[PDB]
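Aim 2, interim progress: modelling of the magnesium ion-bound target.
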Amino acid sequence: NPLTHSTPKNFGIGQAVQPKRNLSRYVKW
Amino acid sequence: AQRVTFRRRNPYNTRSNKIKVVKTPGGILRAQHVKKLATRPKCGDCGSALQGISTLRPRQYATVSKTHKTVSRAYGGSRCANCVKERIIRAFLIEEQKIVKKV
Amino acid sequence: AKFLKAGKVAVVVRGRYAGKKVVIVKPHDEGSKSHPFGHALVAGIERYPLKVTKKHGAKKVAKRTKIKPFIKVVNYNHLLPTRYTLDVEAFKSVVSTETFEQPSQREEAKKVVKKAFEERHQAGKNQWFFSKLRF
Amino acid sequence: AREITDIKQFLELTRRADVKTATVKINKKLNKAGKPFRQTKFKVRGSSSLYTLVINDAGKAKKLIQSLPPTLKVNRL
Amino acid sequence: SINQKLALVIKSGKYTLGYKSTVKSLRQGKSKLIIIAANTPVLRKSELEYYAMLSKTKVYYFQGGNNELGTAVGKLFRVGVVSILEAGDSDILTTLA
Amino acid sequence: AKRTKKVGITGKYGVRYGSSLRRQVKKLEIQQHARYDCSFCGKKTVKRGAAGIWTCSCCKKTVAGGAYTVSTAAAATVRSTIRRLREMVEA
Amino acid sequence: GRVIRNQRKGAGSIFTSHTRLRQGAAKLRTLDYAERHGYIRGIVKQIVHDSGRGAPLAKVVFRDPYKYRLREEIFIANEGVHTGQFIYAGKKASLNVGNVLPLGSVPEGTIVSNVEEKPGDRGALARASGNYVIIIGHNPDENKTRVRLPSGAKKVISSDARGVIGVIAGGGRVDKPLLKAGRAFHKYRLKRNSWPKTRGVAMNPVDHPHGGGNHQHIGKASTISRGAVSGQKAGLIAARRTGL
RNA sequence: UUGACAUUGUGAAGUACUUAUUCAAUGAAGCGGAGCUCACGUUCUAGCAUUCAAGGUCCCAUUCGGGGCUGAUCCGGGUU
RNA sequence: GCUUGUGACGGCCCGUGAAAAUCCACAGGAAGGAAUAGUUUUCAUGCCAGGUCGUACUGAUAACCGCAGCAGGUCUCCAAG
RNA sequence: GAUGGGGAAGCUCCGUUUCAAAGGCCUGAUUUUAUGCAGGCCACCAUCGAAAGGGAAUCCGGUUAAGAUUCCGGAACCUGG
Ligand SMILES: [Mg+2]
Ligand SMILES: [Mg+2]
Ligand SMILES: [Mg+2]
Ligand SMILES: [Mg+2]
Ligand SMILES: [Mg+2]
Ligand SMILES: [Mg+2]
Ligand SMILES: [Mg+2]
Ligand SMILES: [Mg+2]
Ligand SMILES: [Mg+2]
Ligand SMILES: [Zn+2]
Ligand SMILES: [Zn+2]
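Predicted structure of the complex, ligand included:
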């Protein structure tokens, strides 16, 4: 517990890189 | 007074066809093809040369040890000492401002 | 008015340890027989502890929390003072002017600081001191 | 191509399990202002480089001649 | 007006001109006021503020470049930062200046 | 000593191209090869490279400017106009 | 007769553009989520010179929002833009020189350059040195904006079209006389094969509709109608008026 | 270049919509509606930003680890 | 001194004077690792192999092109008193 | 200059990343046998184009009626394993 920290990432514009999301709506079929 | 000739097949005075005149142990003058001079590595932040790094051809860096291609500091063979100094000063002062700007 | 005390924390700017955080132990404001300039005796971190999560095993946590210390004399102009502090009363005796200029005594002082620094990392405190500066 | 100035490291190269030939060369050379002397160049033919040891005094040079292993073919002059 | 005040400090007080000398005074705690030119680089300007924050030293931002700040001190060369070691007959340490 | 009466730098062209044309180039050549004070370090070491590129010799700062001047008159008016607009748009 | 000179340029054998030393196509950043809902900060790494273009070029590096990478863009530098300056592009970007904003989010009278004819074409208007577009009003309904072009023509564009604040650098270039044919030779050497130009009246009737005759003269009216065909459009094309 | 006919459908009054057709971009990323709290994370500085994300919660059968939800709100698959 | 190589500089441009293969370093810390033992083949030394095609001579008032053993034409390096 | 496509009665024309489901080396899994199968990496998307451009590595001495930095003797270097 003392060695583990909560470090949330900012996913706003210009902040940390976006994570993997579901892009099924934009798939080039 | 003795005149020399090209030793390769190229008869044209190109960049890769430069010669130097030397005196052989046999007592005669003979042309000697030389290689193009190497260029010192340059810093990626200011463009200046880097100390402690050998000046070799690009493919000649694979036959030397790592000691000849870097120094014992962070960003050793990439950035010079002053540029690394500026990064640390910039990094520390800006991150302290982020805490201040939070409140 | 004075901040270069025996507990201040600074950042090394030159000489194989640039960007690594150290704590001042024995400052020397007015020169010395060697180093005829303002300097101080510091102990710092060369390899910072790695990040530990809840999924790491028992033995893997111990490996990732190893700390490699170093002891060096640094000029004042080659340091960047910070606003943080760290108590050095545990390992003040081992580091001194006699500690240097003796390879055997340099090694013995390092293992004392390593034990002191590591036990501080457990039961987390001075978290800014044990985080690697990014640059 | 390579010159060694230590007699101790010359002996170990002489028994490196790959050297098969050696040669000794005598040079009649003049000193800076003294009488002419003679120097001996002990050369060992390695698998990659030729090693040379230069001995200027004749007394020490004569001692090193019999120290060579008998299994090494030495070409005199 | 601080330009008239700076002249009195020159003939009656102690001052140091230059970035390196100013930093040395701040570390020693001998400084009491630092004057920063307008065209000072922000990275250098930020470092001086941090040094003054640790030593509890007031900071004044000069309204002009190093050409103008150097002229106020009375020198013929560009001056980046001026540190006031101790004022003489002037009252620059007790005013807004 | 003063070598030329009025041609100045345009003496390289001799008697060719006409006096009126030579006079016009003279005004734009002195400005092109002039020294300018850097606004980032205060030193008078700014000189033109290619047309529109102005770089300081000491701090190596490159600023985009006019063809033969570090700052044209129309660019100056834009900065004043932009400054005025940005003061009433954030208020 | 034969095929006249201006007809031969369409084939494009020796009349193509010399693009060996070009630094790239100067275009704005691709319109993405960040541009229309915020802003992204860029860095002016260096200002370079492009062959055949009077206006200097600025290289601005951005961060890819979706992958750990760095993207470089080639912009047309405006006046006052310097290396190391931060550039903000997007709807929420502040009104500063060198920033790229949609035309519908700026007050009237703003000076802009590298304007987009349509949202997403990455800059079409006011790209030459010293030219700029003046915004003369807005239209909140049906999302339109009125602008003034350097030629003096009023155009109506959508409010989502983008543009950079300022004036294209390198102005005043056309004020210095070339003073000789050598400098004109090197000027077009980096652009295309269109110099020198031979007068039609000095040719033969086979070569141009102006050549021939015992005196060097045109012979017919030089005002050619818009309805003429290829080989006839030599001279003044659809001239509303002539003279000084 | 101009008119007629075909491509060529839908609605209203004295121009409106979409599906044909046409134009443009993107290695088709955040579109439309609604719900949380006009907005709803980023502007002194030429630094840094990547390991299905740390943390929180719930499982495996505890071995070095593995897997859901949340973190990062739903609905419609119309890439814009 | 002559020829040539190179270094630091200066002048000129509305002219700013190629590209790719290939090699290297750094940031990063994913994994692998010591007590009766492992890794380093970027340190030294030792072992094996390197296929295919071109290679003679002229290069010109006689070996090239001009009907020819034609005073023409034809790219370039070395240069003594 | 092919392929995917679009023209042309047709020989063939356009086009080189274009309205395309366009591709493979780092391993783990298996000790039935060789490669099917588990996460991840990657999307640049033919090819041809310089014996004066870019470019891994050799020099001296001797030797023929006619060949050599290629042969001989000695002394080196580079690449791959
Ligand atoms: Mg004629
Ligand atoms: Mg005609
Ligand atoms: Mg006619
Ligand atoms: Mg031959
Ligand atoms: Mg013949
Ligand atoms: Mg084709
Ligand atoms: Mg090829
Ligand atoms: Mg070549
Ligand atoms: Mg021969
Ligand atoms: Zn540097
Ligand atoms: Zn400057």
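The helical segments of chain E are 2-12, 19-28, 42-55, 66-73. Residues 50 and 56 of chain E are 10 Å apart (CA to CA).
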